[PDB]
Tab-separated table of C-alpha atoms and ligand atoms in Angstrom:
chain	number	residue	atom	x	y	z
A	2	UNK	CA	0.000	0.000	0.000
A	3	UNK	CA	1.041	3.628	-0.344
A	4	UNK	CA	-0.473	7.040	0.859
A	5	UNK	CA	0.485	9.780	-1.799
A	6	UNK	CA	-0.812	13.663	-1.367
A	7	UNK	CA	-0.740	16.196	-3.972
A	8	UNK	CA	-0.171	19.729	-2.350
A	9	UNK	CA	0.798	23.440	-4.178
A	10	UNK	CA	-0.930	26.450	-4.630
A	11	UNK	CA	-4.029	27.988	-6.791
A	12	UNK	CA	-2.342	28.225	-10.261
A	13	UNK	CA	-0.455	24.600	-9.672
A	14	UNK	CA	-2.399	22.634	-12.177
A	15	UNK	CA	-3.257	20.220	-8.810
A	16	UNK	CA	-6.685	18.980	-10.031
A	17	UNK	CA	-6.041	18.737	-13.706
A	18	UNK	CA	-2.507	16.598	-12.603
A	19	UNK	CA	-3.958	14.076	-10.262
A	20	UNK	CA	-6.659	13.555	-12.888
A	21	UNK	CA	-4.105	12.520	-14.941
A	22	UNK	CA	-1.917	10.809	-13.113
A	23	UNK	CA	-4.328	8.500	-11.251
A	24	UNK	CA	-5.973	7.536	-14.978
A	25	UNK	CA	-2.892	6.371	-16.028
A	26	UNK	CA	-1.890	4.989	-12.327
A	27	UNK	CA	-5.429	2.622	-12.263
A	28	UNK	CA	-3.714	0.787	-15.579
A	29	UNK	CA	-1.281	-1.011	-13.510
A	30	UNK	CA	-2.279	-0.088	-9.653
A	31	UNK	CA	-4.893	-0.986	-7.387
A	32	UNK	CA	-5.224	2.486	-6.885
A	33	UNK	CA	-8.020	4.924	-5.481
A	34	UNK	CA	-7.961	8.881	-5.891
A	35	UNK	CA	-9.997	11.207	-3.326
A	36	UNK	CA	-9.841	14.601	-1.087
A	37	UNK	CA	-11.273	15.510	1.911
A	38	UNK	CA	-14.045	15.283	3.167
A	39	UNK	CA	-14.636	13.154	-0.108
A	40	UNK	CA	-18.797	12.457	1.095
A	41	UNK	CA	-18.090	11.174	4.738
A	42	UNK	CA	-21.321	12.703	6.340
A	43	UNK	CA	-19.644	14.175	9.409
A	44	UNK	CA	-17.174	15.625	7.263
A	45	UNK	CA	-19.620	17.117	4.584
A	46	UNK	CA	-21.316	18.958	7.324
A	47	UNK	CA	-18.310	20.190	8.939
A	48	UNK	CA	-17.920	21.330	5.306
A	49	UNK	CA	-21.057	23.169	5.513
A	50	UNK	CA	-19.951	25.243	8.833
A	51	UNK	CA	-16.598	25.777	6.893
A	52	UNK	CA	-18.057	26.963	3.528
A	53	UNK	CA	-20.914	29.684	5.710
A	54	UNK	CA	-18.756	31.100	8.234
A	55	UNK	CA	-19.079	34.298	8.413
A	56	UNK	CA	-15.316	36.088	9.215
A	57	UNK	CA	-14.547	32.548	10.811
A	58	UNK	CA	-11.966	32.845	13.469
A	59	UNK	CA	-8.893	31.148	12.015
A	60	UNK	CA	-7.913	28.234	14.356
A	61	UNK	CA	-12.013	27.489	14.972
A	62	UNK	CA	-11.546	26.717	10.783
A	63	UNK	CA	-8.247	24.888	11.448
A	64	UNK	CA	-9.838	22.680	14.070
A	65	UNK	CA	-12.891	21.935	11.203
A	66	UNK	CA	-10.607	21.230	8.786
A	67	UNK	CA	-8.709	19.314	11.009
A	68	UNK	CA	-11.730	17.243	12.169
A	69	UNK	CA	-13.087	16.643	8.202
A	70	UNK	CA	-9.852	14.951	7.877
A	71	UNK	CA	-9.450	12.576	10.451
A	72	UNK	CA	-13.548	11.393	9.406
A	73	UNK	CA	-11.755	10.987	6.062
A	74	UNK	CA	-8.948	9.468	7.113
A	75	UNK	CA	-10.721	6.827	9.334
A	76	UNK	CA	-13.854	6.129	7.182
A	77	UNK	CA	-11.883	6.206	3.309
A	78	UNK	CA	-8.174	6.441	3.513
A	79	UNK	CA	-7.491	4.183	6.629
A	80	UNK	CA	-9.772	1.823	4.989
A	81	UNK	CA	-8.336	1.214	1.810
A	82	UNK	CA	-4.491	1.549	2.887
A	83	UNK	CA	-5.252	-2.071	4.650
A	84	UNK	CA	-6.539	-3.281	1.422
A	85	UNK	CA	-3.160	-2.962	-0.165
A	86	UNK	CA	-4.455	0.233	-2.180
A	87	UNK	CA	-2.667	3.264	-3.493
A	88	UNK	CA	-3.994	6.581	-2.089
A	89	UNK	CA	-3.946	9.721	-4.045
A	90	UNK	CA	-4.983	12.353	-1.634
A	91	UNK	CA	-5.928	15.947	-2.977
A	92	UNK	CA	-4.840	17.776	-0.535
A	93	UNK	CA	-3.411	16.573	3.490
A	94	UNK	CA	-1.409	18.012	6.305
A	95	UNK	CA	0.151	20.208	4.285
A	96	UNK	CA	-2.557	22.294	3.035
A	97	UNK	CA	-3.357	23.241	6.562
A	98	UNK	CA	0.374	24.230	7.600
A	99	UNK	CA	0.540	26.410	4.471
A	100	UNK	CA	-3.023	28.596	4.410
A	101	UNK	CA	-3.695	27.967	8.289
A	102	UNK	CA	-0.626	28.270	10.109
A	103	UNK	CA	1.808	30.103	7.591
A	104	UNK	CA	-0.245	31.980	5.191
A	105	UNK	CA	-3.346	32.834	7.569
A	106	UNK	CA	-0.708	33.121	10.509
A	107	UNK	CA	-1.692	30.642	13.118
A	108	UNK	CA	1.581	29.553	12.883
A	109	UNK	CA	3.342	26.101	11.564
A	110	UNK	CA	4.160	24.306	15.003
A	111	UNK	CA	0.852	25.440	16.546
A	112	UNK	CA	-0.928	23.879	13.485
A	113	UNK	CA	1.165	20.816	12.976
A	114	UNK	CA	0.169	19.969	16.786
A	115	UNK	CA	-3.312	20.305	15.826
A	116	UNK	CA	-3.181	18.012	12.908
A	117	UNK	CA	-0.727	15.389	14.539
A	118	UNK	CA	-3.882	15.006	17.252
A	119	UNK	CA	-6.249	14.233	13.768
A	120	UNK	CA	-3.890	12.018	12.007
A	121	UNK	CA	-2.478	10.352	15.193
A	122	UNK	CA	0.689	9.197	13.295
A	123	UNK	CA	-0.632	8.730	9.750
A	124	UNK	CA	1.677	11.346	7.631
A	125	UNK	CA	1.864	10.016	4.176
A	126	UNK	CA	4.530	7.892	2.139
A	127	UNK	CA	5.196	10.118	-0.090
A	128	UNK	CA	4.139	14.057	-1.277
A	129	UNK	CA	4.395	15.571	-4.989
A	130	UNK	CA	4.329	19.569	-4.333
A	131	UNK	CA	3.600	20.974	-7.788
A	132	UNK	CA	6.387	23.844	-7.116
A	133	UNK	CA	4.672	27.023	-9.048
A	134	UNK	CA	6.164	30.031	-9.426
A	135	UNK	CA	4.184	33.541	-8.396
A	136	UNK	CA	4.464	34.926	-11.328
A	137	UNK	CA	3.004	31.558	-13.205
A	138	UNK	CA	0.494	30.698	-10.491
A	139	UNK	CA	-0.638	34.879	-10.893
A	140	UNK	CA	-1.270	34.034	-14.841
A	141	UNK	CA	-3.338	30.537	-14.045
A	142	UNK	CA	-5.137	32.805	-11.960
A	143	UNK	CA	-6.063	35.581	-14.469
A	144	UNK	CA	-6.474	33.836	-18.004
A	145	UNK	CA	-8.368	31.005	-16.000
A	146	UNK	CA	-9.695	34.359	-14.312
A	153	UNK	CA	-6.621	42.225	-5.614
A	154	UNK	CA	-3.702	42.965	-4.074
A	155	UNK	CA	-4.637	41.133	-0.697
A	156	UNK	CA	-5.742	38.019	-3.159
A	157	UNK	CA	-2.220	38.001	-5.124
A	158	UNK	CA	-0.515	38.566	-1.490
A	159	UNK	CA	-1.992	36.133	0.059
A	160	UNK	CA	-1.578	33.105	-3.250
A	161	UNK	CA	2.456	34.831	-2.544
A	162	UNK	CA	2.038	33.593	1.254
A	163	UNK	CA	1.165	30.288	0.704
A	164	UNK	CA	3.938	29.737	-1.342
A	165	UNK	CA	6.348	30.718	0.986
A	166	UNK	CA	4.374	28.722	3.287
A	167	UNK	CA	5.052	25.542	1.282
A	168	UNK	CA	8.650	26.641	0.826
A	169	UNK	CA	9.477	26.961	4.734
A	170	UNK	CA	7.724	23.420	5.333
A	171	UNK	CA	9.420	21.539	2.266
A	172	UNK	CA	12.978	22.999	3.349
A	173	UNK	CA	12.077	21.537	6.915
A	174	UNK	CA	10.714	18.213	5.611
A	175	UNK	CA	12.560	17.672	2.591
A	176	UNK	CA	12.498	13.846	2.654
A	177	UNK	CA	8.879	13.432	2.491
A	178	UNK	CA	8.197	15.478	-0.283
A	179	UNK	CA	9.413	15.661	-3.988
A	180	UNK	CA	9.166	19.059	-5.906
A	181	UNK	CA	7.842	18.827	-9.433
A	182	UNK	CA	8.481	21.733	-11.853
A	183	UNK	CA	4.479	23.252	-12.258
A	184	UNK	CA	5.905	26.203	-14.152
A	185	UNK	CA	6.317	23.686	-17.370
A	186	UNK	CA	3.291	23.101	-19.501
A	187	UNK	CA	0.949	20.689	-17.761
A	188	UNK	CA	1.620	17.777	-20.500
A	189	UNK	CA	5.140	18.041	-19.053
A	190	UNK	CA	3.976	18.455	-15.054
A	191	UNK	CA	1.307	15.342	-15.659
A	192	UNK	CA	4.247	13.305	-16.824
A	193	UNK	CA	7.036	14.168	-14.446
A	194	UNK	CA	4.650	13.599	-11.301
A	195	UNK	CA	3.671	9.950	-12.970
A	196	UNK	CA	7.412	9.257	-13.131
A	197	UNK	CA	7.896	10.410	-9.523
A	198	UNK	CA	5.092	7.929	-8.487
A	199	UNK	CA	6.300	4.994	-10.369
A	200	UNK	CA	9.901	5.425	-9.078
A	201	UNK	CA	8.509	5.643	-5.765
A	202	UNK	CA	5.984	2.414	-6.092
A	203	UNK	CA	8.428	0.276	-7.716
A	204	UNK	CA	11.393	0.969	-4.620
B	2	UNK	CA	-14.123	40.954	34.843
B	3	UNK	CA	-13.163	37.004	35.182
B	4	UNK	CA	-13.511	34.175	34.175
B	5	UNK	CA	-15.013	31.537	36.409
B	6	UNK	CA	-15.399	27.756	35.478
B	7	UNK	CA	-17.062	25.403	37.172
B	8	UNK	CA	-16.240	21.918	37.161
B	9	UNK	CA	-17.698	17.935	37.938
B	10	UNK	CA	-19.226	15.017	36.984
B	11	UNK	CA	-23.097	14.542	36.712
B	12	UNK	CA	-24.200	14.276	40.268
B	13	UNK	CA	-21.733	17.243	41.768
B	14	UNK	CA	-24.845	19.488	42.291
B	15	UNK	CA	-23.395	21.718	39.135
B	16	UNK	CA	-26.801	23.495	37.818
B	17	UNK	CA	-28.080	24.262	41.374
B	18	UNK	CA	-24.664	25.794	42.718
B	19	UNK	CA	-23.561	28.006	39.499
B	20	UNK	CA	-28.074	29.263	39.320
B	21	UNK	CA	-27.572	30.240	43.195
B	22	UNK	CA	-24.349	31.649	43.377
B	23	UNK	CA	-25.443	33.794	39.919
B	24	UNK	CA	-28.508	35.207	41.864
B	25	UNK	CA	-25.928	35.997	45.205
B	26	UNK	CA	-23.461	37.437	42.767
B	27	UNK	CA	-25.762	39.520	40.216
B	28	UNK	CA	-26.809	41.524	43.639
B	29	UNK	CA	-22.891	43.199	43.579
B	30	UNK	CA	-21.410	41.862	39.825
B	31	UNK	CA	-22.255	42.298	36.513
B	32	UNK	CA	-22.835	38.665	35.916
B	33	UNK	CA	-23.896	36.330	33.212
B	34	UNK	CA	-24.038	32.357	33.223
B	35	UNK	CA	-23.395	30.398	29.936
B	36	UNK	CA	-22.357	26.767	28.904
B	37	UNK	CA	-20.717	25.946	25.447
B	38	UNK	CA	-21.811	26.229	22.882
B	39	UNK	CA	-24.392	28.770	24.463
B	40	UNK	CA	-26.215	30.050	21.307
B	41	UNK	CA	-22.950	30.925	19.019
B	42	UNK	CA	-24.429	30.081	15.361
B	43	UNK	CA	-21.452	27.901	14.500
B	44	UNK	CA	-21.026	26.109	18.069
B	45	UNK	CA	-24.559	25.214	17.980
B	46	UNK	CA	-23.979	23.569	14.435
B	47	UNK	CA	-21.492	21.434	15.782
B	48	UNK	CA	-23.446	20.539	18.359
B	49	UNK	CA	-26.271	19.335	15.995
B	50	UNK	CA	-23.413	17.207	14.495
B	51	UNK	CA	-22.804	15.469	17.992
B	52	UNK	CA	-25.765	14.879	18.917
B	53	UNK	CA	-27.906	14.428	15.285
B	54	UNK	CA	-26.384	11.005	14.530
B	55	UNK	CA	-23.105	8.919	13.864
B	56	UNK	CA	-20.961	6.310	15.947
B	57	UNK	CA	-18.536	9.021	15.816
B	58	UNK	CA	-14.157	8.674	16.337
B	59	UNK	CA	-13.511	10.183	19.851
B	60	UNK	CA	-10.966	12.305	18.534
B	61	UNK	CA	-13.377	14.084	15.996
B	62	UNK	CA	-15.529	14.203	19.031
B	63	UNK	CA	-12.891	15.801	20.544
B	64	UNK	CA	-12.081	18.109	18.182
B	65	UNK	CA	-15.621	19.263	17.786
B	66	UNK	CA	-16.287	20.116	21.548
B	67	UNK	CA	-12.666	22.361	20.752
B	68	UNK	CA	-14.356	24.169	18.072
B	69	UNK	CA	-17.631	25.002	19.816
B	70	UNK	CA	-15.168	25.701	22.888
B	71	UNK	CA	-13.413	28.480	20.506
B	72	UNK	CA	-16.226	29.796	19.692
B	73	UNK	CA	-17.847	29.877	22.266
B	74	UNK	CA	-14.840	31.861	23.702
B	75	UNK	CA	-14.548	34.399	20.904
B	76	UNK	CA	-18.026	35.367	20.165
B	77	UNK	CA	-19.309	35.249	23.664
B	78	UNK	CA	-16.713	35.076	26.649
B	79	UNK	CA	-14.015	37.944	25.446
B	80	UNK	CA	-16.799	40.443	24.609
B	81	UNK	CA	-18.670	39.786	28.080
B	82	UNK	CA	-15.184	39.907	30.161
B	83	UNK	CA	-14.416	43.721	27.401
B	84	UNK	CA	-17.530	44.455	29.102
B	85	UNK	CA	-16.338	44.199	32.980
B	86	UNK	CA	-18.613	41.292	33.492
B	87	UNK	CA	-17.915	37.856	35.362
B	88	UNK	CA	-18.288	34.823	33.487
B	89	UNK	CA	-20.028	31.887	35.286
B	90	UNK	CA	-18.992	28.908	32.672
B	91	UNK	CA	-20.650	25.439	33.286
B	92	UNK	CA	-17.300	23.290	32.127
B	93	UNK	CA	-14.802	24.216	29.781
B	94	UNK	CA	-10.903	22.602	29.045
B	95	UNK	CA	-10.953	20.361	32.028
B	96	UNK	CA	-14.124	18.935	30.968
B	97	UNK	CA	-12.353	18.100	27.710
B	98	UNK	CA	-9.675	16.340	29.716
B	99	UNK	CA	-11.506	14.300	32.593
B	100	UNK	CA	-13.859	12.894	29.456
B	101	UNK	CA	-12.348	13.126	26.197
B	102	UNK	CA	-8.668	12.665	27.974
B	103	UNK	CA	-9.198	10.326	30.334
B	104	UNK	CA	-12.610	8.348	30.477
B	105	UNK	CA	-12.447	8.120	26.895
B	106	UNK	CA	-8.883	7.218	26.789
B	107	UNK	CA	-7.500	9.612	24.477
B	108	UNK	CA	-4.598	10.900	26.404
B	109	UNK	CA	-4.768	13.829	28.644
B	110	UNK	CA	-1.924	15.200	27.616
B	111	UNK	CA	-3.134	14.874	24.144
B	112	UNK	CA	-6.016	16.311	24.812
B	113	UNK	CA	-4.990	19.145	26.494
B	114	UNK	CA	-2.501	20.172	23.567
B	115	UNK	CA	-5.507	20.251	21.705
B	116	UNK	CA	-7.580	22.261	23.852
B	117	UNK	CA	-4.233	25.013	24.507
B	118	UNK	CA	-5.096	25.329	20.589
B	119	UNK	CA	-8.357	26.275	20.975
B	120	UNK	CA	-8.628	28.396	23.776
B	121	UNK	CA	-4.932	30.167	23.121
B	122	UNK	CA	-3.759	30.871	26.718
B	123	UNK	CA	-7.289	31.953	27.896
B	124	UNK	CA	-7.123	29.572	31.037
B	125	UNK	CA	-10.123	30.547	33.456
B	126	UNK	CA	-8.869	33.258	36.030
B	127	UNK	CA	-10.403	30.348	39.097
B	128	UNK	CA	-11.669	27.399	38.368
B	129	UNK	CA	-14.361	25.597	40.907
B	130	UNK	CA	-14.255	21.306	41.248
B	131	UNK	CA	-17.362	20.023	42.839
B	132	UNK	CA	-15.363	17.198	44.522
B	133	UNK	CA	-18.265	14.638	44.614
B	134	UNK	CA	-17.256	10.825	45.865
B	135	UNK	CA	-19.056	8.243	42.936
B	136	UNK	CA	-21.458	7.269	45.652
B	137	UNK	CA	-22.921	10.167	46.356
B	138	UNK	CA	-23.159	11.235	42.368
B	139	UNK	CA	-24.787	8.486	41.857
B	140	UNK	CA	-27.619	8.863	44.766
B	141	UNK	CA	-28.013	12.348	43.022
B	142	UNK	CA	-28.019	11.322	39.414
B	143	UNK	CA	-31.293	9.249	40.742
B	144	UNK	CA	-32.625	11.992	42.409
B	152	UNK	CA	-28.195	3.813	35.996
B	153	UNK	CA	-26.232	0.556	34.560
B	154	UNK	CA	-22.817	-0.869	34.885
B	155	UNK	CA	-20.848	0.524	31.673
B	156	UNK	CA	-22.642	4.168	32.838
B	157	UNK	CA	-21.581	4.115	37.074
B	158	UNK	CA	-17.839	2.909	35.611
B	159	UNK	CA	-18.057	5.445	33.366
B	160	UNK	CA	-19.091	7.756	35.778
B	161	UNK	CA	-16.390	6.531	38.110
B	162	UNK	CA	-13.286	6.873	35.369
B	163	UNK	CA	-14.930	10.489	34.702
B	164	UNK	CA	-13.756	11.440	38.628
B	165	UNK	CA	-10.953	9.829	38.251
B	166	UNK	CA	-10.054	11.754	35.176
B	167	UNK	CA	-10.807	15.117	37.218
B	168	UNK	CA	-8.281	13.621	40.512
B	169	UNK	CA	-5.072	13.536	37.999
B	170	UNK	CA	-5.756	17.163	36.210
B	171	UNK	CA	-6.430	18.149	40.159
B	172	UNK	CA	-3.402	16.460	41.114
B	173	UNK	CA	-1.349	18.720	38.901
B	174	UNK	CA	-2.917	21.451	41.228
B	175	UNK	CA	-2.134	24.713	42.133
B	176	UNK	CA	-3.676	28.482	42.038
B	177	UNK	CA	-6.456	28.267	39.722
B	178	UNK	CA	-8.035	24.941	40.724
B	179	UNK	CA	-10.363	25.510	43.821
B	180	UNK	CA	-11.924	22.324	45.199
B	181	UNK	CA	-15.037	22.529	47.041
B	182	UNK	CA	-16.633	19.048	49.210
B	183	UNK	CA	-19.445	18.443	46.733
B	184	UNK	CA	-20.491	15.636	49.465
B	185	UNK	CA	-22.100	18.104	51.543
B	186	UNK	CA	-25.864	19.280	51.315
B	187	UNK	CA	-25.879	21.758	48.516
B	188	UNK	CA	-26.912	24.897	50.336
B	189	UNK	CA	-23.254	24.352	52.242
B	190	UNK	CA	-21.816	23.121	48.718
B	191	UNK	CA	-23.321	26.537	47.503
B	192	UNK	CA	-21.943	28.711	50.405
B	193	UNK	CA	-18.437	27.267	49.948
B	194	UNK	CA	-18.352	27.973	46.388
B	195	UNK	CA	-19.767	31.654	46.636
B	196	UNK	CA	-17.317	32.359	49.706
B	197	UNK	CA	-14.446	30.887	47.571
B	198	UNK	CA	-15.670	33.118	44.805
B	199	UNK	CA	-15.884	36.108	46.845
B	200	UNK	CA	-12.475	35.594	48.084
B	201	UNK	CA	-11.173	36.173	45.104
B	202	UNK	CA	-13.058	39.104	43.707
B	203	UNK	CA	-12.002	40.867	46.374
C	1	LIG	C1	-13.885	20.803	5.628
C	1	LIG	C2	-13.453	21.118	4.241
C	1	LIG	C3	-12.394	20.438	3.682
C	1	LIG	C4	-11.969	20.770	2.410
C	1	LIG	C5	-12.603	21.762	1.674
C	1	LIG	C6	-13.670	22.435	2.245
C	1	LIG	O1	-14.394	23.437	1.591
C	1	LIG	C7	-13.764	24.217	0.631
C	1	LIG	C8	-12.884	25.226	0.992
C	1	LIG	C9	-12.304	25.984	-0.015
C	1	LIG	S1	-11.135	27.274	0.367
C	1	LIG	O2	-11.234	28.293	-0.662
C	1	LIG	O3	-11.351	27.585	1.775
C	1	LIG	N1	-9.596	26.565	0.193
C	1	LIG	C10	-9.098	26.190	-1.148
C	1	LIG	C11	-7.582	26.085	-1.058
C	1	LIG	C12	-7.196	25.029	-0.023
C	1	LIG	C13	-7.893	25.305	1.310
C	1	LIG	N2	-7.565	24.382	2.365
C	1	LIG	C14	-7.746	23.026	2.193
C	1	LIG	C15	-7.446	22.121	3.141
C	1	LIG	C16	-7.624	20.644	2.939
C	1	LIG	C17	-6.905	22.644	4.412
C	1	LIG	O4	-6.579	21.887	5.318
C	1	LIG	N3	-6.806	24.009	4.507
C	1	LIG	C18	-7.170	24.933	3.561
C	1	LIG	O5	-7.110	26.144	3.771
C	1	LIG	C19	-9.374	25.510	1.201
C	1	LIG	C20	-12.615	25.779	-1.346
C	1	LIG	C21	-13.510	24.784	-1.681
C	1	LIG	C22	-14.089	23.999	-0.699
C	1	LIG	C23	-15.052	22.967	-1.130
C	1	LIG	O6	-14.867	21.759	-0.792
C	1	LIG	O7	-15.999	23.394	-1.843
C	1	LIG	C24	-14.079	22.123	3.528
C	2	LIG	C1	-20.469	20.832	20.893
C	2	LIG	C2	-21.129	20.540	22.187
C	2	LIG	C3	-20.712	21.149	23.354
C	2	LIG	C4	-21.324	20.873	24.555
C	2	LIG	C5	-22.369	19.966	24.583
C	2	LIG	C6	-22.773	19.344	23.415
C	2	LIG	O1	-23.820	18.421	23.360
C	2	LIG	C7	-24.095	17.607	24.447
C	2	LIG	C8	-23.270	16.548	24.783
C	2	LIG	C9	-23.624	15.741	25.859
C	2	LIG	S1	-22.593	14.367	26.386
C	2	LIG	O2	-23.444	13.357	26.995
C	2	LIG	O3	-21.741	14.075	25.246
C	2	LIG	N1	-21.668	15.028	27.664
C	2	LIG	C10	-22.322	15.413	28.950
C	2	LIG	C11	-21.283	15.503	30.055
C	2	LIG	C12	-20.177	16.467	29.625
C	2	LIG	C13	-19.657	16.112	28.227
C	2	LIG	N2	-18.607	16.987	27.749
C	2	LIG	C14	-18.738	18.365	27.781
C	2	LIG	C15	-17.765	19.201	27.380
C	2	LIG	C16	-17.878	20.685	27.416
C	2	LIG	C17	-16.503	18.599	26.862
C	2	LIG	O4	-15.552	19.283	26.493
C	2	LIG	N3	-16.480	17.213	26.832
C	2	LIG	C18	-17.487	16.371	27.224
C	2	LIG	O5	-17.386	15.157	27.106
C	2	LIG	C19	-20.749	16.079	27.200
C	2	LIG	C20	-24.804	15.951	26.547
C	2	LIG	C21	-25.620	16.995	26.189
C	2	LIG	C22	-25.274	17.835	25.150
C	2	LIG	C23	-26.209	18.927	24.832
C	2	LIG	O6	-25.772	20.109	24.866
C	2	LIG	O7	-27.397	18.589	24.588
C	2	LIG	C24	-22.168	19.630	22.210
């Protein structure tokens, strides 16, 4: 079995590349592709309270975010790791250190402690961080298409930078400024290199 | 202002001490009484999720009492203490850790790192513990079967170690008494400390 997320910015080309990958992946893998909460009924309607909060105080949204993902984790992901499955996760961990602790400026530590309570151990195999510049994540998100909007997409990528340089071994950069024919197939070759080791 | 918690399992006499030492208090204090998640629109959607069905993981549990704890705190305890009022809460972090901690088996100390998330360093200024022996919790709960009195019994267990790591703002009142000395004890230690 092997638990696989997919983290990076707006702008990345996440969604269109784990599309990708995981239909080419299911050819030769007993694989399964979700996100969070990915219709676990506690975690839709924690979903709900996320999605009509009204100027939500930051960690209160960590903690639901937090709380979505261990129901996802337990109920889908737990699951089908003891099937022998692959797990392509859109989106883990990760996503809340960047926007909730760096980005929104909870801090890192204060939310990795949070989400080491809701994943009590389970960080995964292996991460692809589609590694998109400002500049080309600011164009995916204007011909796809504020200064507190662009500053913001700007602190999340610094967010992923300071937890990739502290957690290098976990994660493996892939070049999202290339076009996404390019991205699609250097993330496959990442996960084959990794399943077949 | 401050911030007063009370503390206990079922059967400590909770509702009738914090409703009588609110009207003794109101008579000098601006004071209001509240419980979690005490009419916030988004705590009382995750209450609806606790309670409206699922066998539910104890540690989303446990996250979900921290999120109607938070905002509980931020939309209704900070602007009552801005206003110079005291806070009567019914249970708050130690709650958390006696059941969620400890009863439940999660880990106190794993618990409580979750709850120093949500409440960030808002610890109540005093907090009351209606020390209550089982026995006598139980003749009051009455007033049920096996799995619920060990229950009940690992719940005041729970509260003896967070007690044990004592000092300052833990203030332990004989919940064995009648109430109406249960209730003087607690307003005297209240007043105490107002003053
Ligand atoms: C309970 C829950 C979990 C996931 C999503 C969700 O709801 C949404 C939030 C947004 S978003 O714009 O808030 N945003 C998009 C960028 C990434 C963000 N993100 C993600 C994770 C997993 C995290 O941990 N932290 C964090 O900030 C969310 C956008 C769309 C949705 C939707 O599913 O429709 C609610
Ligand atoms: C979101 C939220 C917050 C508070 C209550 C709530 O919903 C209820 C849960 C129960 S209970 O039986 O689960 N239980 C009763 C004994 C004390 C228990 N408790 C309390 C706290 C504050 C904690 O942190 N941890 C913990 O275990 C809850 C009983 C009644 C209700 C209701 O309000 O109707 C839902």
């Amino acid at each position: 079995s092997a638990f696989i997320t997919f983290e990076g910015p707006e702008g990345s080309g996440k969604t269109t590349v784990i599309n990708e990958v995981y239909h080419r992946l299911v050819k030769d893998y007993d694989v399964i592709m979700t996100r969070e909460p990915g219709g676990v009924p506690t975690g839709e309607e924690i979903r709900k309270i996320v999605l009509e909060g009204n100027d939500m105080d930051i960690r209160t949204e960590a903690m639901l975010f937090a709380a979505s993902r261990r129901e996802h984790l337990v109920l889908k992901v737990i699951p089908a790791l003891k099937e022998g499955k692959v797990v392509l996760c859109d989106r883990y961990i990760d996503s809340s250190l960047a926007y909730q602790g760096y980005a929104r400026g909870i801090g890192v530590e204060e939310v990795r402690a949070l989400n080491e309570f809701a994943i009590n151990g389970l960080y995964p195999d292996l991460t692809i961080y589609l590694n998109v510049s400002a500049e080309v994540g600011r164009e995916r998100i204007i011909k796809n298409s504020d200064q507190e909007d662009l500053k913001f997409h700007e602190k999340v990528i610094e967010g992923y930078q300071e937890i990739i340089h502290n957690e290098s071994q976990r994660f493996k950069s892939v070049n999202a400024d290339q076009p996404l024919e390019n991205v699609v197939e250097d993330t496959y070759q990442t996960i084959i290199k990794y399943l077949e080791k």
